[model samples]
Target: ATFEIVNRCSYTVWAAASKGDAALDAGGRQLNSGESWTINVEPGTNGGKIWARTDCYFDDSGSGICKTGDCGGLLRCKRFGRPPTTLAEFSLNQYGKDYIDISNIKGFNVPMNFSPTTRGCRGVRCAADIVGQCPAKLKAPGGGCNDACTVFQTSEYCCTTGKCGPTEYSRFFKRLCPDAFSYVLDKPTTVTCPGSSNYRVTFCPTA
Candidate 1:
């Protein structure tokens, strides 16, 4: 029913969530180092991804650019962010369950984690030193790792025809965070819990 988005990274970030026209946290929330935002989403709020923007500078009018995860250069994002970023995705209160998936289908800019507050559900610890180990071909312009789809833009990479296999780039991410949703057709990676459960999305999480 709720998601607690926390920033445990050493630096600041602007988090954005998009689900249709309903923007979570007013589309954007600036979390300073060690800050958190708890969002109570409505039931059936499905198929949304929550990601954070890095190295951003937004003016008082909520207009600016982020080095990573920039959504049309808007602080209050009205849409899903541009890639080369990690995401914590969820579908809340759907059929008496909540589904959560931490995905890097687009890229990996920041380390991320998704954990349900419910006791029985295990967390998806999807963070690793992906940036440091990223290959050159998939490197983002702003110092992050991108998927082959973003780099090559080919049917093979993006799976345009809906029939494709995992490539070197997706494999690299899979090797790093095996639980992450690396490719579009990767089998069910979502963690499910009771609909009443709350969850936490942690950035730069450590033991």
Candidate 2:
């Protein structure tokens, strides 16, 4: 059950058009320029026009009007109210009381003014698409075996945890396997890949 009351004064009253779109009192929140609020009634039409002006108390616009140059001649008058919905009642808890209308929201193309029970921002937009896995193998810092390589502890058994050690030599042939031998003394310490028997070093050309 709802009703409205009318009051008359000495001043002349023209057909009231909405101040602009933002005619909803959304608490202290100012309506966006060009946005409109809709009302429902039983019949196709109702009473005479009601003029509205927005008094944006906290609005940054010096004058409540968003467009400073728009509402040139019209006086800054205001009027508006939000209707009730099952989601919530038309209370300050939901919508604010700060009123705005044509005087402040004068513009051609504007957004509509509406509220949701649960207000929130729009959906998510991924920043960058996931481009597959890393292209190439990443190079390790140091050149050495991990701390898990085993070495010979004695003539009979091998060391269980001797990770960092010299190359492993199965046997040392005299001449035919010259490169297969390890240097007995510190004569230009020869460090060859443990399994290779051929020369692996090359000199750079002068050219």
Candidate 3:
């Protein structure tokens, strides 16, 4: 299977990925608006991530920095980057199908759309005004919106164990993007697709 990462933003964006110790797209790539990158996956691959970084600078050797989604200042990430990021969480060929989720549990930095190209699977998108209308207390510099749990570190925002309901902040995000994962105990909003399907992830996609 393949994943197509497209930059539909008006500005440049660095796309990053990580799976175990392996990196995708050379760990990171700067995609000018309208540009794209691709990742081909092997069967049984799991727990992968794809996210966009904004206001970034990097060198030829993949060493640099991003104001948001900075994975230890390395353009090539071996692990998940810092939040608030909108990551496309995906897995391929698990029990004969692929699973995909547009997760905002890390909070939001950019508008994103994660979808299947060949199958009839539903696309999960969070193309909301998250950066523009972030709550004052949860705003991260450089346009990232912090998750409540990350900011509060309390049971009011986090459900470390057992079930929980939405908080004021999670409700705020849910109002804007119903398809995204808003809180730790939120229902399973992830979608399933045929293993043969290719996927597309668009950043700053038009409504």
Residue 154, model 1, lDDT? 89
Tell me the tens digit of each residue's lDDT in model 1 across 5-117: 89999999898887846676678889999999887766778887788899999899999899999988888777888888898888877898888888888899989888988
How well does each candidate superpose onto the true structure, as a TM-score? Answer: 0.94, 0.15, 0.94
Model 1 per-residue lDDT at 63: 93
How displaced is residue 13 in candidate 3, in Å?
0.6
Query: Ten-residue segment with the worst summed lDDT in candidate 1?
Result: 17-26
True-structure lDDT of candidate 1: 0.85
* Residue pairs in collision within model 3: none
lDDT of 3 at 29: 79
Per-residue lDDT tens digits for candidate 2, residues 1-207, read 011111121222111122233322221122233222333212211111132222223234433332111132333323322100000011121121211111101111111111221223111111111111111121111211111111223422222343322232211111112221111221121221111111100001010
Higher-scoring candidate on lDDT, 1 or 3: 3
